């Protein structure tokens, strides 16, 4: 039938561009589905921050895997998962790929940042040599099914400029990476060059409050981008909404003022497809 | 042991989660308890200055994309509880439904919630032992069955850990029958009582004086029950007020809105005013304290 | 798609876990299924050349230090199943007790076992809906209740995935009542049938021909039931023979012995002859293939 | 009352020496308890191998934590847990300590091996500089309760000889490590020197089939050792027993020959304390 990795490859192809929305949990995935998104995303920083932790590589394969499993249990919508640098050496990478496949994950992204750091080493954005990242990619490709999508993420644009970035990316593709992930380029007219040089489908990361700008989906597609990621958008809005409710309750002693801002029970039941549970019991049993 | 108040070394007893909950219930008037579906939410609640937090059973299920039909088990709720208590020492109350099975399952639930550093649980008098194809229902077990559940829990619990008996009987059997069950639950060893928000706030003094132990009023939305202020409920002898799903419902509407924006406009520009700032995020995560810790302990 | 047999490209269909189990049941006469409590045991079983493996419900509980009293839930067994299927593609049959709850819990159990790459489950006709303080018992549910459980499972299962209906009725209701239940279970959509080892091997031809679907005989130790050889059981129309706890019981006696040795002699010298060699361990773990993989893919 | 870490400190003191047995799972812990051991151990290699994985640092905090939780749920006997090199930098170490405490673990051991290695780096026994390990220890000590025991394991004897090993160990103690873990020394008369130099309670690792020898508990105690670890002893015997049963069933078509080698149902019920469950239901209910 349709394998997760296939569904992702297909979505990447038939969408122009493919919009991929972050969802921090299964219910958010169901909202995204209901709105008609074709692919969803589990953000690494999202996993950490939702646990109340900074995005400093404290989390491991199990933290991400559990959140991924929760999502894929609720939806068949193809899921892309941030695996950071792969959580360790060759065999850990291999374990990550195999477990993500077992969890019905469609795609992962893995990046060219350094991991191997002294105990007390400060938060940084340092790149590994091209060869080290090649090794990472080989480790993953060795175990992956054909369908399953490995996205190589480079963080080198910010540090090494467009040319060095195209050079890394191309080497990553020949090491077996299926697709490429780069931050949103500083100039949308850098994109046609970047995309035609790497040939494989390219992902532009539309973060908020970062160094990088926002462009529209149409705009990015017209400049040769095939995937556009919104890694934390919903999450940031959820947090503002929650904080507002808490502040309301604390200040007013009741949640009256917040009621207009709440999803209705009726809408919640519809997203959960509650009726289909009732109908299932009527369809199968009696009494 | 002793802690300094300024320069003065005075007695101070370190408190266990369950003690911190008992103390919060005492020093607050009334104690407001807010639902948080995850650790980040718990930190927001902490930041606003709530003294207790809550892990909703329906919240656990719905967040997994499941209806609140008793599908989830000890492990589902325990994992979400562990995630929260890892991030905060703020006393956490956890919904354990009917206890997930018979006497030894209840015992396991109590013990594991204690090990997860949970302060309190609530367990309710709904029927569990339903035929395979039984339709969703609000049936109560007889008072004796619930007594047995409470005995199972009390048998294993530490002294400090709080067991809250929840009755769902008000809606179906009225005030008197509800007071009767609750009183029996207290004598079976329930530390506190949990009931829906009564339809008439002037039924509360009667209810509270009859059961004597601290009473929780459940401030749900979009249900049958009304809303009152915390002050109002405290004036009628209520000692805890729970907001089980409030934040979650708002989070869902906000997420949906962002999704709809991105889908319709092909960019999230319109959504930016409605997003928490990265700076606020960093502050709630206490990011700076991580940087300072590395400077405090190491070189370079 | 096509696979080479030597130089010749021929048709070959990749098989799903549940297919591999169906195929094993077909090409083996009979299929021996061995219990393994963990992934290492599963690899030992594989190394000896078993074609299927088993995750025992009582094994899951007892390994956690718990009696087999229905305390454990979907998550306990699922985690142990996941650990095994991570290590081996050998088709795994998993005990799901009564399904851990009503219709949607059963459905969840089936779906999660499929996602964990499990080939088959067994689900049984024991009572689940017991009062809080109910004593350990071997009560059966009526045939209709079990039919409902099976319908719940079949509703969600893939075609290949195997649902085995286990009856515990032989011991309490005799051969006829047992055949009656089993036949009803097959028509409710059970793929295969699981019964205790019959007290008389000459009751098997009757039992097997009446239920038509592949039958499993449970070769327990220290129970009421006898032992027969695999050949013997196959000659009487049995297609699966299960050894649910055999290895585990031996492992426990061995562990205890080592502990006793160390305690009594202050060193493990006497135990060394009874230990697997490090070299054997390395071979079962296929350690060399890790070294070769690094040489195959990288430099230095 | 009695905190796990306290119970471990106390056992280390009042036993001469303290024998610590590996138990791979809760049932094994209960056997060890029944035999009268005072402390138990969760081996890192045991965790990996039981998962069907080589001891190559593929496992993470979650793998070990889950197995630890399972054991501590069943027994209050103080548990020492192998945390390898701590599964990452400063904050991962801190997470490991805090989670082990929450799991009711009494002690951990952390070692001075290198972790930070290229993707395809081969299995090795290379040491980090003394300073790197100091950093690791500081990270752990920063978060640990007073009671909870941090054991610094050095693997330097084999590579750097006795003197360099004493030098590392002493620095580890002053970095805040509560106790020291070394392989079994090649000569039991190296021990008095080693133990008096480091002052803190010392652990000798009694592995089988290794480079290092076996000595008796009495022998090691007389040479100034306060803990003796049997990391895999029971596990190796369990594996031989299991394999024999499998071979029996496969060859003979029945498990008859293996029955003499099985724990009886009666003994199993006693270890599980089954009777106390029956008595509890009679003590609390009726009918
Ligand atoms: Cl003073
Ligand atoms: Cl050919």
Q: What is the DSSP string of A10-59?
A: HHHHHSSSEEEEE-SSHHHHHHHHHHT-SEEEE-HHHHHHHTT--SSS--
Q: Which run of H or E residues covers position C240?
A: strand C240-243
Give yes or no for a contact between D223 and D187, defined as CB atoms under 8 angstroms apart: no
Cβ separation of B131 and C129 shorter than 8 Å?
Answer: yes
Give CA–CA dist C86/D131, Å, rounded. 38
- Other beta carbons within 10 angstroms of residue B111's beta carbon come to 16
Q: Which residues contact B263 (CB under 8 A, 6 or more apart)?
A: A19, A35, A36, A37
Chain A contact for C154, CB < 8 A? Answer: no
Spatial distance between the Cα atoms of B11 and B5, rounded to a whole number of angstroms: 10
Residue C188 C-alpha, separation from nearest chain D C-alpha, in angstroms: 33
DSSP states along chain D:
---HHHHHHHHHHHSSSEEEEE-SSHHHHHHHHHHT-SEEEE-HHHHHHHTT--SSS---HHHHHHHHHHHHHH--S-EEEE-TT-SSSHHHHHHHHHHHHHTT--EEEEE-B-----TTPPP--PBPPHHHHHHHHHHHHHH--SSSEEEEEE--HHHHHHHHHHHHHHHHHHTT--EEEEEPPSSGGGHHHHHHHH-S-EEEE--SSSSS----HHHHHHTT--EEEESSHHHHHHHHHHHHHHHHHHHHSSSGGGGGGSPPHHHHHHHTTHHHHHHHHHHH---
Strand partners, D154: D182
Tell me whether strands D179-183 and C2-5 are parallel, antiparallel or unpaired: unpaired
Those residues whose C-beta lies under 8 Å from the C-beta of residue A3, and which sit 6 or more positions away, are A145, A147, A148
Q: Which residues contact D198 (CB under 8 A, 6 or more apart)?
A: D166, D169, D170, D173, D180
Q: Are B291 and A123 in contact (CB under 8 A)?
A: yes
Contact criterion met (CB below 8 Å) for A242 and A236: no
Q: Please report the sign of the dihedral spanned by the C-alpha atoms of residue B54, residue B56, residue B62, residue B66.
A: positive
Query: Are the CB atoms for D149 and D178 separated by under 8 Å?
Result: yes
Q: Of the bound ligands, which one is closest to the alpha carbon of residue C7?
A: 2
Q: Hey, are the CB atoms on D104 and B115 less than 8 Å from each other?
A: yes
Ligand with minimal distance to B2 CA: 1
Distances (CA, A) of B39 to A47, A132, A274, B61, C53: 11, 35, 27, 16, 39
Fold of the domain spanning C16-246: TIM Barrel (3.20.20)
**What region does C49 belong to: left with phi over 0, alpha with psi -120 to 50, or beta?**
left
Helices (H), chain C: 17-27, 39-48, 57-63, 74-87, 103-115, 143-156, 170-187, 204-211, 230-235, 246-265, 278-284, 287-297
Q: Chain D 214-273, CB below 8 Å of chain A: which residues?
A: none
Number of Cβ within a 10 Å radius of residue B283: 12
The CA distances from residue A214 to A156, A185, A229, C250, D124, in Å, are 19, 10, 11, 64, 47
- Contact indicator for D176, D150 with CB cutoff of 8 Å: yes
- Partner-chain contact A73 B63, CB within 8 Å: no
Query: How far, in Å, CA of D63 to CA of A259, rounded?
Result: 43
Architecture category of domain A4-232 in CATH: Alpha-Beta Barrel (3.20)
In chain C, residues with a C-beta closer than 8 Å to the C-beta of A284 are 103, 148, 151-152, 155
Nearest by CB to residue B297, choosing from D98, D104, D142, is D142
Selected for mutation to probe chain C from D234, D258, D277 (highest C CB count within 10 Å) is D234
Q: Is the peptide bond before D17 cis (omega within 30 degrees of 0)?
A: yes
B209, B237 Cβ separation under 8 angstroms: yes
Nearest to C243 by CA among D246, D268, D238: D246
At what resolution in Å was this solved?
A: 1.6
- Within 60-79 of A, beta carbons closer than 8 Å to B belong to 66, 70, 73-75
Q: What is the CATH code for B14-246?
A: 3.20.20.60
How many CB atoms sit inside 10 A of residue B300's CB? 8
Considering only CA atoms, which of B44, B42, B22 is closest in space to residue B87? B42
- Kindly list the domain boundaries of chain D, sorted by start residue: 4-232, 239-284
For residues C169 and C177, the answer to whether their CB atoms sit within 8 Å is yes
Question: Is the peptide bond between B30 and the residue preceding it cis, with omega within 30 degrees of 0?
Answer: yes
In terms of Cα–Cα distance, which of A135, A17, A165, A4 is closest to A73?
A4
Q: Which of D263, D276, D281, D287 best tests the C interface by mutation, with the highest count of C CBs <10 A?
A: D263
CA B269 to chain centre: 36
The residues, any chain, with a CB within 8 Å of residue C93's CB and separated by 6 or more, are C21, C33, C52, C53, C54, C55, C118, C119, C120, C121, C122, C162, C164, C242
For residue B218, indicate whether it is catalytic: yes
Residue D13: HSE in the Cβ half-sphere, 13 Å Cα cutoff? 6
Whether B266 sits inside 8 A of A120 (CB atoms) is no
Three-class SS of residue A7? helix
Give just the sign of the alpha carbon dihedral B243, B247, B248, B250: positive
Task: Please tell me the experimental approach by which this structure was elucidated.
Answer: X-ray
Judged by a CB distance cut-off of 8 A, whether residue D195 touches chain B is: no
User: How far does residue D149's CA lie from ligand 1's centre (Å)?
Assistant: 30
Single out the residue of D206, D42, D240, D70 nearest to residue C40, CA to CA: D240
Q: Tell me if chain A has a CB within 8 Å of the CB of B11.
A: no
If DSSP codes are grouped into helix, strand and coil, which group holds residue A153?
A: strand
3-state SS class at A203: strand
How far away, in angstroms, is A72 Cα from ligand 2 center?
Answer: 40
Give the catalytic positions of A in this structure. 41, 55, 82, 84, 109, 111, 119, 153, 183, 205
From the candidates B28, B46, B95, B248, give the one annotated as an active-site residue: B95
User: Does B95 participate in catalysis according to the annotation?
Assistant: yes
Give the residue among A44, A164, A139 at the shortest CA–CA distance from D117: A139
User: Which chain A residue is nearest to residue D55, measuring alpha carbons?
Assistant: A91
Looking only at Cα atoms, what is the longest distance across chain A?
Answer: 71
Q: How far apart are CA D71 and CA B115, in angstroms?
A: 13
Quick one: how far is CA C146 from the chain centroid? 20
Cα-Cα-Cα-Cα dihedral sign, residues A101, A106, A112, A114: negative
Closest-CA residue to A135 (of A107, A98, A94, A179): A94
Contact between B210 and B183 (Cβ < 8 Å): yes
Peptide bond preceding C258: is omega within 30 degrees of 0, i.e. cis? no
Test C86 with A99 for CB contact under 8 angstroms. Answer: yes
Backbone phi, then psi, for B187, in 5-degree steps?
A: -80, -20
Sign of the dihedral defined by the CA atoms of residues D170, D171, D174, D177, in that order: negative
D108, D151 contact by CB (below 8 A)? yes
Four-CA torsion C195, C197, C199, C203, nearest 10 degrees: 60
Which residues 6+ apart lie within 8 Å of B230 measured at CB?
A253, A254, B30, B32, B241
Distance CA D239, CA C283 (A): 13
Q: Which of B88, B108, B158, B293 best tests the D interface by mutation, with the highest count of D CBs <10 A?
A: B293
Please say whether the dihedral angle defined by the alpha carbons of residues C154, C157, C163 and C169, taken in this order, is positive or negative.
negative
Whether the CB-CB separation of B107 and B62 falls below 8 Å is answered with: no
| A21 neighbors A230 (Cβ within 8 angstroms) | yes
The candidate with the shortest Cα–Cα distance to D92, out of D131, D64, D120, D126, is D64
Q: Which helix (H) or strand (E) holds A149?
A: strand A149-154
3-class state of residue C14 by DSSP: coil
Residues D208-225, buried b or exposed e (16+ Cβ, 10 A)? Answer: beeebebbbbebbbebbb
**Which residues contact residue B107 at a Cβ distance below 8 angstroms, ignoring those fewer than 6 apart?**
B152, B153, B155, B156
Q: Which of C195, C237, C243, C193 is nearest to C52 (CA)?
A: C243
């Amino acid at each position: 039938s349709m394998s997760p990795g296939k569904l992702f490859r297909q979505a990447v192809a038939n969408e122009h561009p493919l919009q991929i929305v972050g969802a921090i949990n299964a219910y958010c995935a169901l909202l995204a589905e209901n709105v008609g998104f074709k692919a969803i995303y589990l953000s690494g920083g999202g996993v950490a921050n939702t646990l109340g932790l900074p995005d400093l590589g404290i989390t491991d394969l199990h933290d991400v895997l559990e959140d991924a499993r929760r999502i894929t249990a609720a939806t068949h919508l193809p899921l892309l998962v941030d695996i950071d640098t792969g959580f360790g050496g060759a065999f850990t990478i291999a374990r990550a790929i195999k477990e993500m496949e077992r969890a019905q994950v469609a795609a992962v992204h893995m990046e060219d940042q350094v991991a191997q750091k002294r105990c007390g080493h400060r938060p940084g954005k340092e790149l590994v040599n091209t060869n080290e990242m090649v090794d990472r990619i080989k480790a993953a490709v060795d175990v992956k099914s054909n369908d399953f999508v490995l996205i190589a993420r480079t963080d080198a644009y910010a540090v090494e400029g467009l040319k060095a970035t195209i050079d890394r990316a191309c080497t990553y593709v020949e090491a077996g990476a299926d697709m490429i992930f780069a931050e949103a380029l500083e100039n949308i007219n850098d994109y046609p060059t970047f995309c035609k040089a790497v040939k494989v489908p390219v992902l532009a990361n539309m973060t908020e409050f970062g160094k990088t700008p926002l462009y529209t989906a149409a705009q990015l597609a017209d400049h040769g981008v095939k995937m556009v990621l919104y890694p934390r958008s919903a999450d940031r809005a959820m947090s503002k909404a929650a904080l507002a409710v808490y502040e309301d309750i604390k200040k007013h002693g009741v949640q009256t003022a917040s009621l207009p801002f709440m999803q209705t029970r009726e809408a919640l039941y519809e997203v959960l497809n509650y009726h289909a549970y009732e109908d299932k019991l009527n369809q199968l049993f009696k009494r």
